[PDB]
Amino acid sequence: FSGAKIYPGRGTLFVRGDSKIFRFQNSKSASLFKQRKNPRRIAWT
Amino acid sequence: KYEAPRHGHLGFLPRKRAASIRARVKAFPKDDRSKPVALTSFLGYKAGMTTIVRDLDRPGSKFHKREVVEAVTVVDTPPVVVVGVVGYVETPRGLRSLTTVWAEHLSDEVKRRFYKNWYKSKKKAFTKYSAKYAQDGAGIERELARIKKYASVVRVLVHTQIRKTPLAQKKAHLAEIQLNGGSISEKVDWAREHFEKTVAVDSVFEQNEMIDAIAVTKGHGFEGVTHRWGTKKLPRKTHRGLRKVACIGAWHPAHVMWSVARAGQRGYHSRTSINHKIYRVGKGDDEANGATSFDRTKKTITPMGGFVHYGEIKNDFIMVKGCIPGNRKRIVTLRKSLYTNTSRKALEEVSLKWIDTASKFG
Amino acid sequence: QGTKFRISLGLPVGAIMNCADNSGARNLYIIAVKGSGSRLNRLPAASLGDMVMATVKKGKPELRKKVMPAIVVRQAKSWRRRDGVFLYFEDNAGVIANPKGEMKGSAITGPVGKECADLWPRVASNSGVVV
RNA sequence: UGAAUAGGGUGAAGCCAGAGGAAACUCUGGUGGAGGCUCGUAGCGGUUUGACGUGCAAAUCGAUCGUCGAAUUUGGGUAUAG
RNA sequence: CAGCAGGUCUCCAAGGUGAACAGCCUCUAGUUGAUAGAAUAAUGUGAUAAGGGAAGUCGGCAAAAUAGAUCCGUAACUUCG
RNA sequence: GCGGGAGUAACUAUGACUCUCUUAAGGUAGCCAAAUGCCUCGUCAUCUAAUUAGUGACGCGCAUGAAUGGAUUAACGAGAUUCCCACUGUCCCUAUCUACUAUCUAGCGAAACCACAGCCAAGGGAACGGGCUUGGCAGAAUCAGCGGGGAAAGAAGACCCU
RNA sequence: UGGCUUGUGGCAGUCAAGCGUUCAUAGCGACAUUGCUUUUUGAUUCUUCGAUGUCGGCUCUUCCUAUCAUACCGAAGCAGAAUUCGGUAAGCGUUGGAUUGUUCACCCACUAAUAGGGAACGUGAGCUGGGUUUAGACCGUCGUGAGACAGGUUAGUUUUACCCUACUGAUGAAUGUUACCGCAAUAGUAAUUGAACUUAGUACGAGAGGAACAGUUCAUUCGGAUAAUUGGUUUUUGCGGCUGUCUGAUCAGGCAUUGCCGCGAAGCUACAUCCGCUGGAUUAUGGCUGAACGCCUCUAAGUCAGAAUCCAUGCUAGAACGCGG
């Protein structure tokens, strides 16, 4: 989920749709893709 | 008297517990008939892994010299201390010595160990830690030991130095270790300069050989037939026979042999894994890890934090691409490889491109 | 041929999978694989960039029925690339092909893989969105 | 011959009103009565599955399933014996 | 027969939440049985999960989809109940 | 209770109709390959990666037929098949965590229950021997495990005849 | 049921006249038989009633090769290559679905391709109980009938703790003692195939076609190793929502309805990660010098080249193997 820093040779990409490129970053942030927690409340993301 | 196919490895019989915490190996890897003096094995502690982002060894690949993600056990190798270089020769009976050549000063963790002070077990007699034994007269007669003609492989009884690795105990871990070299004469001559106190790590392990990964594995449970061998379940999965099995014997004859699919100890021997190819040797601090993702868990080399259940590494390590038995805390014994398969990729160092560092957790 | 990848399990016999090219069935099928070998209970797992065989279970009679073997395009399983970049898609979908690997329709729609087009240069001709 | 079914949904037949129809059909509301109408508890029946069988009852126990104003269930007294 | 996981007529009817007498939960009011501690294998007894979607087994057995209130919209044909 | 043999229409191919024998005298309306069919993967269409079910007929009825009845024909079910939509730990594919016990301990205290004995390969043989012939092999103090034999827990076998 | 024979018969040697272009044996084979053998398919009451419980499949415990495929060789009435046939030799690999209770019967999609025989077919105190020994009821067919049938249909008991042994793990004790570990006189073990880069557009040919042989890499699959860039679980410790009641009330806090229900990381693991072929002894076969035997030729003197398996390397271990200071 979160707006962290992806490495050149690390980082899982989900392309669900017409190649809608998402990615995980943090472990805690991958979790907020089940629950759908929006970046309104959670500020650091 | 039928057969069903070989689910699981047969010849780990008997499945005996490896009582001693360090692994043993009777059939040692035979001489480096190239390097004039070496050891056969060494010493390590199992710590944790990193993802080495490097490039391939095999140079003709379809995706040659791309980015390659790889496993690596970064095991800590403090050098071992000699008590005495035992001069095993022959007699007309067998493999019998004549004298050892002692070291003068041992380590500190020789205090508590040299004994067998444990309950329901034998002692030793009062062969405690060293006074000042045979080394002065003994050092010259190991030259005369090869003049016998009745002469064998000369070896050396060693002990560890512990706290240096983050484990805090000061009762040393013992083993004898064989000296290798050019000939029988050379593994005596150059080993006279080894018994001084401590040996070298780099004598046995040259960078980019292979290293066979023997150690002591975990004892899983009293594992039944499903996990220990490799039987299924029945898809009806009712009554008595869920995680059971069928045949153990046979009608004609009633007496079978040691193949049978029963329950008992899994893992936990001094089990040998084959030619894990040595990546690099790094002395101090070089590589790091700690990346905030799920991959595999709970062994992190210098992140923000440390390793869990080990302590943070500030020593001298050897990097084996692959693995080595045990889990956290467990002390391992890295044996070298006698049959080195691929050509030695030494001289220059192997690539480290970049590696992550953050938390491992959230 | 080597995929150079990680080819994962979990595409057994059956396969309700969508029509990846513009032939346009509904439910396809996957029968025997290319180079089979399993056990009873144990289902033959297909993969992506392959050339597994196929009929078509349900749909409409211009695209339904009677074999022409396929090649699967997408799976939602995450697979380890050697260069450390994982990629899972969306929907399962097979291109109904011909027995040495080329599409029956005019082009593939939806995402496709890199390595699927590395294997077959014939399927690489009229690809979809290369991810 | 004595005792027991709370709760909750519909409603022909009879009878009246209102718009509409040559007249009858149609068509809008109220009043009202006969249910194996009908529904959920009491009373009451037994489809599937697991554990028991040297154990709690000489066919047992757990999870699971049916009916109920009708050909309704049940107690007591009394009579019928190869 | 039993100091046995049992048979056994039959009386009375508070608060707030949910039709009632489901459930929910406290009163008036009552009580944990004729042996016990610590670790908590294999194996028999409970739940979770990637990807697939029936492909498995005598056996959709097992297990999944869905659910209320209120409004819209809806199929053959009758012994016309 | 409700028939046989023989002859017969352009042309492949068939018997309307006719004769003859036999008996008390030889069947209508309507339907068919059955809870009944030897013959039969019969014969044809559609479906199916193969598909004999689904569903379309063929005629080649071993042996259909009106009152302990054919036939019209709506409602109802812990009763019986298939196609079709979404889908499913049953399986692929197994892993992980949890409740309770096993391990281990105290107390009091069962159960039907009593062959000298307890290796295997070859050989003879009351006929498939750890037990008998030769040869190879086989030590004891002890506990946790697991379903192959001996053939357990048991009743004078279920077949089978008096 | 076991024994016996091989009846009923299978296979081969093979009498070898025929017939295939000529032409006993490329091939096809009248007419049949001899030895072997125990498979089609049964002759026999020899040996058995204080049990002699069935079929197809799941799961796990062997040995042989009457040989499908992998190593090694030779020949044709075979142009390379497609096609056709025979010998050395048992270490390993030997698919997925549909018709049908069902292997048989019978069809399809691939794939490098999908063998033969025995062993109480491991085989109901591991497992299903569809196939498989009684008891509701009906039809056809037969008999005066109660009812029957070498014909079909509908429902209809898998109990429990292994005495001794096989047997898989863990401890305790024997030539002073002995923490600690190396010999290898010995015991257990591991195993396979395809595609692609590329060889090569070369050999050879009418035309379609396209061989010897290298270097290089990797994908199915198995075991052991497996805890980082993957995928998930994590009742431990934190985070979201709903109902009732108590603690005097409000309030602040609790029990309780599975972890109430809604969402992560300790601790573990795969749907996953890493790794894997030395010397010695010899066979078919071909030669080498030279016989038996004036010539000749692999053997009698003499002397060499030579196969997955064989056999050892690689790892575990009561001198009879954990050595022994």
Let me know the angle formed at the C-alpha of C39 by C33 and C43, rounded to the nearest 5 degrees.
45
Number of residues in chain B? 362
- Other Cβ atoms less than 10 A from the Cβ of B356: the count is 19
Amino acid at C109: T
Rounded distance in angstroms from the CA atom of residue B3 to the C1' atom of nucleotide E62: 33
Contact indicator for B107, B158 with CB cutoff of 8 Å? no
Cα gap B303→B327, rounded to integer Å: 19
Question: CB contact, 8 Å: B53 with chain C?
Answer: yes
Q: Where are the alpha helices (DSSP H) in A1-45?
A: 27-30
Q: Which residue, among A16, A23, A25, A33, would best test binding to C if mutated, counting the most C CBs under 10 Å from its CB?
A: A16
Question: Which structure tokens are listed for C8?
Answer: 């994962």
Residues, chain A: 45
> Which nt is closest to the CA of C9, judged by C1'?
G271
Q: Determine contact, residues C107/C124, Cβ cutoff 8 Å.
A: no
Q: B266-291 as b/e, with b when 16 or more CB fall inside 10 Å?
A: bbbbbbeeebbbbbbbeeeeebebbb
| DSSP label of B68 | B
| Chain A nearest CA to C79, separation (Å) | 9
| Kind plus residue range of the DSSP H or E element containing B189 | helix B186-189
| Residue pair B66/B344 in contact by the 8 Å Cβ criterion | no
Q: Tell me the β-bridge partners of B7.
A: none
d(C-alpha B284, C-alpha B169), whole Å: 22
Cα gap B83→B85, rounded to integer Å:
7
Given the DSSP bridges, would you call strands C70-74 and C87-88 parallel, antiparallel or unpaired? Answer: unpaired
| The three-state (H, E, C) secondary structure of C3-60, written as one string | CCCCCCCCCCCECCCEECECCCCCCCCECCCCCCCCCCCCCCCCCCCCCCCCCCCCCC
Burial (0-12, 13-18, 19+ Cβ within 10 Å), C35 = exposed
> Do B359 and B290 touch, CB atoms closer than 8 A?
yes
Characterize the bridge pairing of strands C70-74 and C18-19: unpaired
Question: How far, in Å, CA of C14 to CA of C54, rounded?
Answer: 9
Q: What is the DSSP string of B313-325?
A: --S-EEEESS--S
Nearest nucleotide relative to C14: CA against C1': E55
What is the CB-side half-sphere exposure of residue B173 using CA atoms within 13 A? 23
Q: Residue for token digits 């929006």?
A: A38
* C105 closest CA partner among C5, C18, C15, C21: C21
Give dist(CA C95, CA B218) in Å, integer.
Answer: 47
Nearest CB to A27; choose among B51, B293, B353: B293
- Rounded to whole angstroms, the Cα distance separating A10 from A23 reads 11
Distance CA B212, CA B125 (A): 36
Per CB-CB distance under 8 Å, the chain B contacts of A9 are 53, 67, 69, 353-354
Q: Give the residues across from B319 on adjacent strands.
A: B74, B280
Which bases along strand F come within 7 Å of a protein CB atom? 47-50, 84-87, 90-95, 119-121, 144-150
Instruction: Give the technique used to solve this structure.
Output: cryo-EM
What is the rounded CA–CA span in Å between residue B92 and residue C73?
Answer: 73
3-state helix, strand, coil in chain A (%, to 5): 15, 10, 75
Which of B217, B215, B273 minimizes the C-alpha distance to B24?
B215
**Hey, is the C-beta of C94 within 8 angstroms of any chain A C-beta?**
no
Contact criterion met (CB < 8 Å) for A9 and B67: yes
Resolution (A): 8.9
Nearest to B155 by CA among B89, B111, B244, B201: B89
Task: Give the Cβ contact number of residue A34 at 10 Å.
Answer: 7
Quickly count: other Cβ atoms within 10 Å of residue B312's Cβ.
14
Alpha helices in chain B (DSSP H): 186-189, 225-228
- Asked whether the beta carbons of B48 and B299 are under 8 A apart, the reply is yes
C70 exposed, middle or buried (CB, 10 Å; 0-12, 13-18, 19+)? buried
Q: Which of B66, B143, B107 is nearest to C4 (CA)?
A: B66
Give the three-class secondary structure for A29.
helix
Name the DSSP letter for residue B204. T
Residue B178 CA distance to nucleotide F59 C1' (Å) = 96
